[PDB]
């Protein structure tokens, strides 16, 4: 019906500023250290 010259345009529904736009194509119209290895009792203990 609406198809024009081999083009299948059929599958279409047919029934501030106020600009006007064209329809169908819109455009303007833990762990804490332990004592060892912490450097005491490694220089100490006079007993």
């Amino acid at each position: 019906x609406x198809x024009x010259x081999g083009r299948x345009x059929x599958x279409x529904p047919x029934x501030x500023x106020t600009x006007x736009v064209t329809x169908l194509x819109x455009x303007x119209x833990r762990x804490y250290l332990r004592f060892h290895x912490x450097x005491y009792x490694x220089x100490x203990x006079x007993x």
Binding site: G6, R7, X8, X9, X11
Partner: protein, 63 residues
């Protein structure tokens, strides 16, 4: 039907115990979420207002 968690607590508990050990279990335990899909392109497709050879013919006729 809204949520998708495994509905039985026993299988979840067994799953997490075996996971703590390091072993697997038989059943599947997926994470919680809502159900539903979004299958786009298994859906609205590109309309073809043109025919098969409309564009090439327009090219030859230069329009």
């Amino acid at each position: 039907p809204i949520v998708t968690e495994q509905p039985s607590a026993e299988i979840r508990e067994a799953y997490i115990e075996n996971f703590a050990k390091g072993e697997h279990i038989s059943a599947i335990v997926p994470g919680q979420s809502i159900s539903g899909t979004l299958e786009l392109s298994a859906q609205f497709r590109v309309p073809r207002y043109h025919s098969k050879n409309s564009f090439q013919q327009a090219l030859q006729m230069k329009a």
